[PDB]
Amino acid sequence: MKLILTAEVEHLGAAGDTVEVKDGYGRNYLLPRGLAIVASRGAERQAEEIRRARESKVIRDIEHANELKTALEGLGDVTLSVNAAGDTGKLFGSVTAADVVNAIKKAGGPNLDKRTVQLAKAHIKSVGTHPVTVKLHTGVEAKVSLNVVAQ
Amino acid sequence: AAVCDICGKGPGFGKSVSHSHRRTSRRWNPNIQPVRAVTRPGGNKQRINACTSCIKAGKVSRA
RNA sequence: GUCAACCGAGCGUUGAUCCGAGGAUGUCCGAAUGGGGAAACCCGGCACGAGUGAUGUCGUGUCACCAGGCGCUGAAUAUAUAGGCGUCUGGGGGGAACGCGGGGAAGUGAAACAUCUCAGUACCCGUAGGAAGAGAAAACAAAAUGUGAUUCCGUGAGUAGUGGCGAGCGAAAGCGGAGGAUGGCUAAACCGUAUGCAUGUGAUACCGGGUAGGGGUUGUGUGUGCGGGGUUGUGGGACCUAUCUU
RNA sequence: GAGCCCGGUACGUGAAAACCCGACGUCUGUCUUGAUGGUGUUCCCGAGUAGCAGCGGGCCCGUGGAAUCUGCUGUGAAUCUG
RNA sequence: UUUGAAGAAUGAGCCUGCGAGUCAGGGACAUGUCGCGAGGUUAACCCGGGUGGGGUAGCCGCAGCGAAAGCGAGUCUGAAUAGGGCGUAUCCACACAAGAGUGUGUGGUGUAGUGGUGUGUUCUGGACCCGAAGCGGAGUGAUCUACCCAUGGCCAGGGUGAAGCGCGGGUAAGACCGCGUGGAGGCCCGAACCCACUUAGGUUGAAGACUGAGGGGAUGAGCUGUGGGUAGGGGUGAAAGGCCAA
RNA sequence: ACAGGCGUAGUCGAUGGACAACGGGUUGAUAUUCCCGUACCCGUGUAUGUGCGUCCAUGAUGAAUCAGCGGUACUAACCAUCCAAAACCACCGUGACCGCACCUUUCGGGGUGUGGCGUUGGUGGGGCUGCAUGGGACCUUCGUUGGUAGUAGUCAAGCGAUGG
RNA sequence: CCGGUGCUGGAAGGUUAAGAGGACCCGUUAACUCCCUUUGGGGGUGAAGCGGAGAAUUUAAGCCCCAGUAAACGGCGGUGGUA
RNA sequence: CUACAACUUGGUAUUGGUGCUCGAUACGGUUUGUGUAGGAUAGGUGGGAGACUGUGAAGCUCACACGCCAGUGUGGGUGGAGUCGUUGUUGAAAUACCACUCUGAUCGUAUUGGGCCUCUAACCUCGGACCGUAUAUCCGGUUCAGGGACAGUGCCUGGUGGGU
RNA sequence: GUGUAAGUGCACAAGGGAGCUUGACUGCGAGACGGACAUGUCGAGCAGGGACGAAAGUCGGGACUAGUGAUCCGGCACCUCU
């Protein structure tokens, strides 16, 4: 079982290393916990490993950061471009958590991951302005207004 | 504990042969282990029985 | 109608009784399926009607479970899943033989008996069909420049063999026939496109040449889906590159 | 104990309707934005598969020198000078 | 059926019906008859409303010996023409050697098989017919009986008088003793009820397990109704190999 | 493996629980059923009043709040504590091992370790403090009292469970 | 009475399966090394690869072994003389 | 007698990490070599006429090792300018120098397994708490708390085996 | 007295002693005995190569009759077989 490390693991290696390890280790500890990815294709895995290592370090949050992120979420609305028909007012495709996250990061500035945005609860499969709740912490939450503009 | 929920493996039937060549019926049971399958990386585990061949091939994801 | 007549009543040339084909009605039990149950008998809900001074009462529908689609909802719990709803399509049971895949004895013969035979028989399970299974060489063959998918008959042959070499068991190659479809379609490598997950030196990159415009056929990746591309054994096919071109 | 008495037979005729077989068209799909024959290299040709090992099944073949086919448990390759 | 049965060995009450060497296969051996004859014959299949016509793939005969390579009227063994084994259909004539039984050569004669089909035995089939105790597969049964579970019911009548409590005695308190209430008990006698020890009858019975006289228990480990459960190498068993529909 | 085995939610199952009728007469045959006399138990409608209410109004005055007190109260910690968390030490015992002491086999060996540690370990000691434990009690939270409007709520006939 | 057979407890040795190990040997032939005949066959060595048998070293329980156990199954003897 | 159920042993799969601790082979090295003729505990060998030196030798005081107590190898200080060549022996030359190296003891780089102490994520819990859920000691899910790569279960294998 | 039970034999010796030696062979075998079959027994003689003997000749174990086990399956060596 050959797998490429994403984070740094003691006694094993650093990020980007391709290691062969007992299949029990990869299946139950590294891969499920997101500490590595399977080594199957160099062009994909190396690029994916680089993206994963940067994403984990850039999307981390602390208790103090969560409070700071709560204030930073007080900015204006965020617009989403989606393919849809203007006659009905309902979307062809489905807004995904990456689409919301990529919208806020490129426009607002805060860096978040898909794991926290509450999307299905808002039922945004339509055209208009909808409020989206974001849970930054077990006790701390945030609300972001979302405006959806059809194609 | 003899039928895998994924590949549908079955216990092969055969005859146990003694020194005196007395043929006695027996079965060859698949190695079927209990596994907590994580269908979606979100992390809700469901309990199923999977053959050790399917585990090795990576047909079930324990995340 | 009949055993099967006797009485009483009627129909028929304006076509009866009869025979054929298609409709309507079809109580109750039965997979039985609204709930229940000692099968053919008890008790209902909902909607629409009928009926009483009103309860009682009567008709017509409809109400099981599971699977799969589809739309809403998304618990502990955050993403979300389980699950809950509503709605459409399916199943369930029966049948004499024949098929296919599983499980699989004993009496018996061996002049006892365990290996073996009886026998993969009896029986059991799951399943279709009008037939099923098999089928288009990772096949035979033996130096012949031979055959050319499968299936089914006749031979090969009770032979080669196998067997406490005991009882017994028992091929195939080849050859002669039945049928004709030596039939078809894919996956990969490449392209185009739509995406999902990433990211971006977010620029000198993505299109064949040249002129120029541009900063996203994303710049790069990747996976998935879909259209071309290809189905071959004297190997074939992708890329590459020369000649003609309905 | 019937060819000439009756039902029939030989031989002809008969379908409103339903069903089944054909046949001719609407209709459906495909080729024409396409084919023919040539030259020298990189990529592809079905993976936990093939192969090997342990225990069995079945083939004339009772594990035998035991090939081919196949089940379960491990181990586990190449893509055509394969 | 017996060495031997009229036998006091077996079977038959009588009559009439019914009741036992058959069939399949190009099977094996033998023997008749028919066709062709160094040849005989087809199987599957095709064409005919038929029993007819076609069908050369195979089989038998035609050369043997040897494990086999192989050789071939010879061959095997063998160092050997040196003997032996198997074979050259058989017979006739003539020569040559022996008279250890005759042998070798020449010449002539020339070789008989195979397809039906009748019959007798035989092979695989249940194989002349009737007949076990028991063996395996799948099911049916606890309405009888064993045990258990839930819920009900029943036990006439009459005795004995436990603990406790009270009084008196006793004592310092006690121990304990007498008299009163009380009414315990797998206690007593005894009907219903449940059993079944003795005897007599029955014994082609009234009854496929009873009756008449006596008999044991009879407030308990009691008897009984209703509904339910345990199933065959299994159940149940205060245990006898008992009970699980005579 | 297949066949199927158990079983939750429920739904069945009287031999039990709950529930309202007695006497007399009559036919050839039925009677607590028919008839006669007198009762009882579920529902429905009409009419008559009694008869309380919702709006309306009565009672509706009065409950919540602002604060204080006074400590529940994580927090930090303290009063600190049951036990001894964990190591410390020693005694005993001896894991191996090292010469040797012993049993020794009659004598020697040889093992053991009666020895050196030490730790198979055990036993005990006190502290290190830990273990958990609350409280006193701090923000917090709330109770009480002092106002804040007898002001905002509340509230009233009657049915009332599938729940206690 | 703990010898026998069980049961319980203890391994210091001996024996002991699978699985690990692959020494040595054999089958095959790349390349050689000898030849014998005249229009290519007969002897030896033989690397690598692929195979066939495979040994030494390892290894568990058990058994052999040492104790206890009879309200465990069980056993509880003969001969001669002698006041 | 031959089998089978059941119990039991070990290997391997599910099955993972860090640590010590070994045992094997491979690597960067040292070490040791008691035939005699002798400067004398003669590696066989190819390079061999020149090497170690002040990034500090002969000679002494000590550490440790083996010891065939015949002596070597080595650390430090001291010292300070040498030991050395066919040098003649001897089948075999130098302890002048360089390359693999074997009889054998060593360390660090690899691999492989063995034993032991650990950890949490596989796996397990009829331990708690919540949800599906109105009712549920079923079941599944989330989480906490404990075990923990053991156990359980496949495949291979040795035992016990009138229980059938 | 004859290796050994009993019988038939043996004084011509088959009994006692001495010298050499391995016929305690290879390939065969006319003709017979006895028998259900399977086994069992005698065999003159031919060839090769030997022993003793001058030679004739004798020798394919022992004075004779007991001292042994079919077939299947498998081991070892050789062969100009597949």
From Swiss-Prot, chain A:
Protein name: Large ribosomal subunit protein bL9
Example of a GO biological process term: translation
Gene3D superfamilies: Ribosomal protein L9, C-terminal domain (3.10.430.100), Ribosomal protein L9, N-terminal domain (3.40.5.10)
InterPro entries: Ribosomal_bL9 (IPR000244), Ribosomal_bL9/RNase_H1_N (IPR009027), Ribosomal_bL9_bac/chp (IPR020594), Ribosomal_bL9_C (IPR020069), Ribosomal_bL9_C_sf (IPR036791), Ribosomal_bL9_N (IPR020070), Ribosomal_bL9_N_sf (IPR036935)
Biological source species: Mycolicibacterium smegmatis (strain ATCC 700084 / mc(2)155) (Mycobacterium smegmatis)
Domain of life of the organism encoding this protein: Bacteria
Pfam families from the UniProt entry: Ribosomal_L9_C (PF03948), Ribosomal_L9_N (PF01281)
Alphabetized PANTHER family for the sequence: 50S RIBOSOMAL PROTEIN L9
Database matches in SUPFAM superfamilies: L9 N-domain-like (SSF55658), Ribosomal protein L9 C-domain (SSF55653)
Family per record: Belongs to the bacterial ribosomal protein bL9 family.
A molecular function (GO) term: structural constituent of ribosome
GO cellular component terms given for this protein: ribonucleoprotein complex; ribosome
Stated role: Binds to the 23S rRNA.
Additional notes on this entry: Binds 2-aminothiazole antibiotics, which are antitubercular agents.
Keywords: Ribonucleoprotein, Ribosomal protein, RNA-binding, rRNA-binding
